[PDB]
Structures are given as C-alpha cells and as structure tokens.
Amino acid sequence: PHSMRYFETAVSRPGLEEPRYISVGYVDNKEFVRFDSDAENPRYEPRAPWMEQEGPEYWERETQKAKGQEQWFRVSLRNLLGYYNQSAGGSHTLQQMSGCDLGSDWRLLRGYLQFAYEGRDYIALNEDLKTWTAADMAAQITRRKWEQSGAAEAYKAYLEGECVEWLHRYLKNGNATLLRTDSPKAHVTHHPRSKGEVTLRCWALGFYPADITLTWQLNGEELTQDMELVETRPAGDGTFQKWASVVVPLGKEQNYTCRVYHEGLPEPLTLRWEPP
C-alpha cells in the first residue's frame, strides 16, 4: 500500500499582518517536501534524500504553485469569515488534505480531498470524486459555489491523474529508501508495586513503519482492557517506540508472554520477563 498527501495550512495573524501558508508533502507517511511562507526565501524544499534527483525546474514550478495557493487561502479565509458573520482582523485556521492511495499493484484505491476551518471538518470531496459533503450551514455555501463552478471535476483529474503519476515516479526514485523496514527490538521491564503486584512492561523500540501490535498473554490467553499502552511515539531518528504493560502477581511473571507483530520482522517476537 502506498500514498501521497499534501497537508496545507493557512494561519491568519493579528491586525494587518499577512497569513502564513505551509504545505507539507508526504509519500507513504514520510515527509518529502515542505513550503513555508515564513521562510526568508520561500520555496518548496526537499525533505527526503531521494528528492535531490529533481531538477531546478521542479522546485520553481512547485514554488510558483505555493505562491498561488497562499493567495487562494487568503481569499478563502476572508470568504469563510463572512459566512461565519464577520470582517477581517481575527486569528483563524484553514487546512487542506489531498492525495491518493495506491494498492500493492500501484493501481488507484481512491482520491482524497478535505478541508477544515478552525481545525473542524468544513467540506470534503466524497470518494466518488464527484459530489461534496459540507459539515455545516456555512460549508453548504461553498458546496453550492463548487457545484456551480464544477470544481470536483478538476480535483478528480488531479487525484486520478497527476497525483498517481507523480506518486509512481516518487516510488521509483525512492525505491531503496521507501521499501526499507526497521524491525522492532523488544525487551520486558519489571516494576514491583503495591498489593504484592508487579508491572511487566513490554517495549518495542527502533521500528519503521509506525504500525505495530503488542499483546500480552497468560499461558496462551490474550489480555483485553487489563493491558495499558502508550500512543506510538517517534524516537526522533526516523524510528518509533511503543510499550504495553500488564499488572501481574509477584512470583507468577514467568506465566506471561509478550508478543510483537511488525511487518519488518521475519516472524513475530515472543518474549518473557528475564531475571538478572
């Protein structure tokens, strides 16, 4: 499974100050390009090593699209301000997500296009890439404007066309990088607590992609709501971490097994608390 996404944000600032526009490109959830209007020389910059392969014309063309996008968001922010009853001056947020998902066969699974205003759903292009779903009354005004101007058609053309052909190119250009997985390295920590109990914590470190599953078992039976787990978190070096813990009786630790499931592994890990 593969994907490309552009995550765009326009943030309006107090008084006279002009809005900040930021665009971030992702290939298979990894950041590959970034434009930031707050930069000294605003331009799309490479964020993945395999992007350096692109000629100077790529960067100028992409940068020019962002300069147009910045202005589009300025006029859209003003229009929304009026739909929700007001004039200029306020601090507001407009966000956009767009892109495509591909199968393992590189065929289009779906196009994707959504907007948020103040971090809440505003308008989405339905999976048919033809019709729109507005979140509220103000958004319905945009829906009718976009239905009248046939906006969905140009979105569908990019999502099924340009988006797929560029993702195919990115996937080819970043083959040695994008196909790489980092196996998790697991270990169990032992934290004696009250009532003659002990927290057994199962750690999974250094893995890529982020998707993982940690399970705890009592002599073959998997543990439900009883198990505590942290949200998967970036290690900061491109890999991720996660832990899952259970509270067990002291002296009975050897009856518990942790299992780690990750695509990067030759097979699932199985591990036990190991004394000194």
């Binding site: 992409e62 699209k65 996008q69 006029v75 407009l94 956009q96 767009s98 907007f115 945009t142």
Partner: peptide, 9 residues
C-alpha cells in the same frame, strides 16, 4: 507534485 485550487471557498 502539488495541486492548485481554482474556485475559492
């Protein structure tokens, strides 16, 4: 490569 919006909101 990125997409350009045309019709404003």
């Amino acid at each position: 490569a990125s997409n350009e919006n045309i019709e404003t909101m």
